[PDB]
Design a protein around this ligand. Structure first.
Ligand SMILES: OC[C@H]1O[C@H](O[C@H]2O[C@H](CO)[C@@H](O)[C@H](O)[C@H]2O)[C@H](O)[C@@H](O)[C@@H]1O
Lengths: 124, 121
C-alpha cells in the first residue's frame, strides 16, 4: 500500500534536472533571443511583468539616463526580473551566463508615438 | 527592419502571465487526474534531500492546528497547478505558475519526512 511519504513524493516532488534548472535560464534565453550571434552580450536583463506594466513605465518617474538624455523613466515599484551576466570562462561563440532572479525597479528609455520602451537602462 | 520597440521586446521581455503544459502532463503522469481532476497541486523542484531537511527547520502550526508542520528556512523553486475554467474530466486542464517561496509541510514518521503539503508563503 503506498506510504504517506511515497504519496507526498508522487504528488509534490519533481526535482529539476541540470538543463531544466533556472541556473540555465540565461544561457538559453541569451541564445534564443539572438543576443550571442555576433559576440556575447556582456549583461542583459529580462522582465517578467506584463508588457502593459512595462510600457506603463514611460509615464512614471522621469530620471536621467546613463548616457545623458532625459527620456528615461524609473518604475514606481519593483518588478520581477532576471539578470544575465557573462561568466569568466565565457568565450564567443560558447557564451555562458550566470542567472540571478530579482525584484527591482527598472529604468528604461522611451521614444516614439506611442511613447514606449526602446532601451533598458538599469535595474535598481 | 525590426522597430526599436520590437528590439526592446526581443531583448528584454519575458512576461510570465499570458512551462505552460507542464501541469497538464505532470498531473496526469502522477495519477492526479485518474477519476476526477484534482483542483490544485504544487510541485517542488529542489532535491529530495533538501525538501526532507525542512522537517528539521522552522516548526510552525499547520492550517488545521497540528503542531507537526515545518516551514523551509529558504525559499524554494515550486510550480503551482490550478484547474482552468475549461477543465472537465477526462480532459483535465491546468494553468502552470512558477514561484520561489518558502514551503510548509507536515512531517511524520520514522525517519521524520514530509507527508502533507500545507502551504507556500
Ligand atoms: O496540494 C497542494 C496545495 O496544498 C495546500 O492546499 C491544500 O491544503 C490546504 C491545507 O490542508 C487546504 O487548506 C487547501 O484547501 C488544499 O488545497 C496549499 O495551501 C496549496 O498552495 C497547494 O497548492
Amino acid at each position: 500500500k503506498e506510504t504517506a511519504a511515497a504519496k507526498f513524493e508522487r504528488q509534490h516532488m519533481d526535482s529539476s534536472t541540470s538543463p531544466a534548472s533556472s541556473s540555465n535560464y540565461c544561457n538559453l534565453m541569451m541564445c534564443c533571443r539572438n543576443l550571442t550571434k555576433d559576440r556575447c552580450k556582456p549583461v542583459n536583463t529580462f522582465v517578467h511583468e506584463s508588457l502593459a506594466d512595462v510600457q506603463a513605465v514611460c509615464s512614471q518617474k522621469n530620471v536621467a539616463c546613463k548616457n545623458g538624455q532625459t527620456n528615461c523613466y524609473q518604475s514606481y515599484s519593483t518588478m520581477s526580473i532576471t539578470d544575465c551576466r557573462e561568466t569568466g570562462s565565457s568565450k564567443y561563440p560558447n557564451c555562458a551566463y550566470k542567472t540571478t532572479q530579482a525584484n527591482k525597479h527598472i529604468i528604461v528609455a522611451c521614444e516614439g508615438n506611442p511613447y514606449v520602451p526602446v532601451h533598458f537602462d538599469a535595474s535598481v
